[PDB]
Amino acid sequence: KGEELFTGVVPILVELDGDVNGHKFSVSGEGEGDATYGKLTLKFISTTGKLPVPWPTLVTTFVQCFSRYPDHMKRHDFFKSAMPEGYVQERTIFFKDDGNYKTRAEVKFEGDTLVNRIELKGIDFKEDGNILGHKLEYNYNCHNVYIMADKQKNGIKVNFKIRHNIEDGSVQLADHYQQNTPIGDGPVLLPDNHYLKTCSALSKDPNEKRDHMVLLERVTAAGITHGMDELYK
């Protein structure tokens, strides 16, 4: 079905307008995905100047439909099943001992292009916190994304904890509460419990002047039966 839509490489467009503790900013991303290898390549650029928050804090915000689901786990892939029409992705991200982001996004095909348009509001951040104070290392760890069906909503409930290395020394945890629901009136794949093993590499474009981020990410569905295909482990 929608599965077919991901047979190969898909171009992606990402749009984000945000406001954190009153700071207004805008980001635009482009790149492509290949669910066959569970691989994404993306570049984002702030259009509103220097980013008021660390790039890393937005990674998760900025298309799980690109995950790699093993053949045997295909009945579990809500994301792809959800579309041509797309899904709405809503989240509440709690930065431990700090503020929080609430986000609402729509992911769907617009032509040949897989698009992710986002609205983000962040509040209660500490002016000299790890976030506003930009105390995060420019890096990213691997994380297990837990997935569950949400029968009642005809979608899924997703939960995970991101671990942000603090330049000072420890880790800044960010707890993610996530919900996905189909935009269309079609039937979707409500899966059995599972998870995606995810890893992201953050870099920069030497020949790029605006504040930006280059993201290389890989996602492999897991939790039901072991695969050698598994990213980590």
Short mmCIF file of C-alpha atoms in Angstrom, two decimals, residues 32-230:
data_model
loop_
_atom_site.label_atom_id
_atom_site.label_comp_id
_atom_site.label_asym_id
_atom_site.label_seq_id
_atom_site.Cartn_x
_atom_site.Cartn_y
_atom_site.Cartn_z
CA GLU A 32 15.81 12.47 1.38
CA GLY A 33 14.78 9.22 2.92
CA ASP A 34 15.17 5.63 2.05
CA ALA A 35 13.09 3.36 4.31
CA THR A 36 14.74 0.43 2.63
CA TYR A 37 17.88 1.01 4.65
CA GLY A 38 15.99 2.96 7.37
CA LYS A 39 18.09 6.02 6.42
CA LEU A 40 17.57 9.77 6.37
CA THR A 41 19.78 12.60 5.26
CA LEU A 42 18.60 16.15 6.07
CA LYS A 43 19.86 19.70 6.34
CA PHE A 44 18.19 22.38 8.24
CA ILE A 45 18.75 26.08 8.16
CA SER A 46 17.47 28.76 10.49
CA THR A 47 15.87 31.47 8.43
CA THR A 48 15.47 33.78 11.42
CA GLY A 49 19.05 34.13 12.46
CA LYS A 50 21.01 32.42 15.20
CA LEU A 51 19.02 29.65 16.80
CA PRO A 52 17.72 30.46 20.25
CA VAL A 53 18.01 26.79 21.23
CA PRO A 54 20.57 24.08 20.66
CA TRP A 55 20.24 22.24 17.42
CA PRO A 56 20.17 18.91 19.17
CA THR A 57 16.99 19.74 21.07
CA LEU A 58 15.16 19.76 17.77
CA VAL A 59 16.28 16.62 16.12
CA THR A 60 13.36 14.53 17.12
CA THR A 61 10.99 17.30 16.16
CA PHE A 62 12.35 17.62 12.66
CA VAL A 63 9.45 11.32 9.79
CA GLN A 64 9.40 7.92 11.28
CA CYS A 65 7.76 6.66 8.12
CA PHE A 66 11.36 6.24 6.95
CA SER A 67 12.03 3.49 9.38
CA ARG A 68 13.18 0.18 8.22
CA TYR A 69 10.57 -2.52 9.18
CA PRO A 70 11.75 -6.06 8.64
CA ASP A 71 9.56 -8.12 6.40
CA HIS A 72 8.17 -9.97 9.35
CA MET A 73 7.22 -6.78 11.10
CA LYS A 74 5.40 -5.13 8.33
CA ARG A 75 1.95 -5.43 9.93
CA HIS A 76 3.35 -3.18 12.57
CA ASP A 77 4.19 -0.23 10.53
CA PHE A 78 1.74 2.28 11.32
CA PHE A 79 3.61 5.17 9.72
CA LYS A 80 3.65 4.00 6.19
CA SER A 81 0.20 2.52 6.33
CA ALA A 82 -0.99 5.95 7.40
CA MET A 83 -0.33 7.24 4.12
CA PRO A 84 -0.20 9.11 1.10
CA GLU A 85 -2.70 11.09 3.24
CA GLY A 86 -0.39 11.34 6.26
CA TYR A 87 -0.49 11.55 10.02
CA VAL A 88 -0.48 14.12 12.67
CA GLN A 89 2.36 13.96 15.09
CA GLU A 90 1.88 15.59 18.41
CA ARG A 91 4.39 15.76 21.27
CA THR A 92 5.25 17.05 24.70
CA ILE A 93 8.91 16.99 25.39
CA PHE A 94 9.99 17.53 28.93
CA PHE A 95 13.44 18.77 29.46
CA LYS A 96 14.39 17.47 32.86
CA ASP A 97 14.63 20.26 35.51
CA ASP A 98 13.77 22.74 32.74
CA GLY A 99 11.21 23.92 30.24
CA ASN A 100 9.18 21.99 27.77
CA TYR A 101 8.35 21.87 24.13
CA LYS A 102 4.90 21.02 22.85
CA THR A 103 4.69 20.26 19.16
CA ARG A 104 2.15 19.56 16.55
CA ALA A 105 2.99 18.40 13.13
CA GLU A 106 1.66 16.96 9.93
CA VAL A 107 3.52 14.47 7.87
CA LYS A 108 2.28 13.55 4.47
CA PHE A 109 3.05 13.47 0.81
CA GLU A 110 2.82 16.66 -1.12
CA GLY A 111 3.44 15.45 -4.62
CA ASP A 112 6.50 13.24 -4.66
CA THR A 113 7.74 14.93 -1.58
CA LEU A 114 7.32 13.65 1.95
CA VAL A 115 6.69 16.76 4.04
CA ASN A 116 6.91 17.49 7.74
CA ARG A 117 5.46 20.84 8.76
CA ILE A 118 5.76 21.78 12.35
CA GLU A 119 4.51 24.19 15.04
CA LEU A 120 6.42 24.35 18.31
CA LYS A 121 5.88 26.21 21.51
CA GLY A 122 8.37 26.07 24.22
CA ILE A 123 7.99 27.37 27.69
CA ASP A 124 9.26 27.70 31.17
CA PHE A 125 12.87 27.34 30.17
CA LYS A 126 15.52 28.57 32.41
CA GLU A 127 17.15 31.59 30.87
CA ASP A 128 20.56 30.14 31.80
CA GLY A 129 19.61 26.54 31.47
CA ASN A 130 21.34 23.92 29.36
CA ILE A 131 18.94 24.81 26.60
CA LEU A 132 18.73 28.62 26.56
CA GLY A 133 22.29 28.75 27.82
CA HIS A 134 23.36 26.51 24.93
CA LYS A 135 25.17 24.06 27.18
CA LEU A 136 24.73 20.95 24.93
CA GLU A 137 27.35 19.07 23.14
CA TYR A 138 26.89 19.07 19.44
CA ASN A 139 26.21 15.40 19.28
CA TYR A 140 23.54 12.75 19.49
CA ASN A 141 23.08 9.34 21.02
CA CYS A 142 21.09 6.24 19.97
CA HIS A 143 17.72 5.68 21.55
CA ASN A 144 14.96 3.10 21.72
CA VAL A 145 11.63 4.48 20.65
CA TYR A 146 8.75 2.52 22.30
CA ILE A 147 5.58 2.07 20.26
CA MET A 148 2.12 1.11 21.13
CA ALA A 149 -1.23 1.05 19.48
CA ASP A 150 -3.78 3.46 20.67
CA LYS A 151 -6.95 1.69 19.71
CA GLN A 152 -9.17 4.26 21.04
CA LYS A 153 -7.53 6.99 18.87
CA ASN A 154 -7.02 4.77 15.90
CA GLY A 155 -3.28 5.58 16.06
CA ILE A 156 -0.19 4.99 18.23
CA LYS A 157 1.29 6.20 21.49
CA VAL A 158 5.08 6.64 21.40
CA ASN A 159 7.44 7.18 24.40
CA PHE A 160 11.12 7.63 24.86
CA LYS A 161 13.81 9.47 26.72
CA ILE A 162 16.44 11.40 24.78
CA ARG A 163 19.89 11.71 26.39
CA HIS A 164 21.60 15.01 25.68
CA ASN A 165 25.20 15.16 26.63
CA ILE A 166 25.90 18.34 28.50
CA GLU A 167 29.12 20.13 27.51
CA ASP A 168 29.74 20.73 31.21
CA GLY A 169 29.59 17.06 32.08
CA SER A 170 26.43 15.13 32.49
CA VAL A 171 23.35 14.35 30.58
CA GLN A 172 20.26 16.35 30.02
CA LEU A 173 17.32 13.99 29.71
CA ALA A 174 14.32 15.04 27.60
CA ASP A 175 11.19 12.94 27.99
CA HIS A 176 9.07 12.46 24.93
CA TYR A 177 5.31 11.80 25.01
CA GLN A 178 4.12 11.27 21.49
CA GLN A 179 0.85 10.56 19.65
CA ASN A 180 0.20 9.77 16.00
CA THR A 181 -3.01 9.64 14.23
CA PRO A 182 -4.02 9.24 10.67
CA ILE A 183 -4.99 12.23 8.70
CA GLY A 184 -7.03 10.16 6.20
CA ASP A 185 -10.30 8.21 6.66
CA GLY A 186 -8.60 5.01 5.47
CA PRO A 187 -7.65 2.02 7.58
CA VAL A 188 -4.27 1.91 9.23
CA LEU A 189 -1.90 -0.46 10.87
CA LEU A 190 -2.40 -0.56 14.63
CA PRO A 191 0.68 -2.45 15.75
CA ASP A 192 1.68 -4.74 18.57
CA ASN A 193 4.10 -3.33 21.03
CA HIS A 194 7.50 -2.73 19.59
CA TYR A 195 10.33 -0.24 19.25
CA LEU A 196 12.72 1.44 16.87
CA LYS A 197 16.37 1.43 17.54
CA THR A 198 17.59 4.82 16.46
CA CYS A 199 21.00 6.56 15.93
CA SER A 200 21.71 10.08 14.58
CA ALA A 201 24.89 11.78 13.36
CA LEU A 202 25.04 15.58 13.55
CA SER A 203 27.31 17.59 11.38
CA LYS A 204 27.90 20.82 9.55
CA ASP A 205 28.17 22.19 5.96
CA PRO A 206 31.50 23.93 5.74
CA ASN A 207 30.22 26.04 2.90
CA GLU A 208 27.15 27.19 4.80
CA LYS A 209 26.90 30.54 6.57
CA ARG A 210 23.51 30.37 8.16
CA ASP A 211 23.02 28.59 11.46
CA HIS A 212 22.24 25.08 10.53
CA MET A 213 22.49 21.36 11.06
CA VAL A 214 23.23 18.39 8.94
CA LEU A 215 21.49 15.24 10.14
CA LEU A 216 22.29 11.60 9.20
CA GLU A 217 19.93 9.18 10.87
CA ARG A 218 19.24 5.47 10.75
CA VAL A 219 16.17 3.65 12.23
CA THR A 220 15.55 -0.10 12.58
CA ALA A 221 12.26 -1.59 13.89
CA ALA A 222 12.78 -4.16 16.72
CA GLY A 223 11.30 -5.88 19.77
CA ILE A 224 9.38 -8.77 18.32
CA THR A 225 11.92 -11.14 17.04
CA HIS A 226 15.59 -10.65 16.70
CA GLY A 227 17.10 -9.59 13.43
CA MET A 228 20.74 -9.48 12.39
CA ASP A 229 19.55 -6.45 10.50
CA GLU A 230 19.35 -4.65 13.85
#
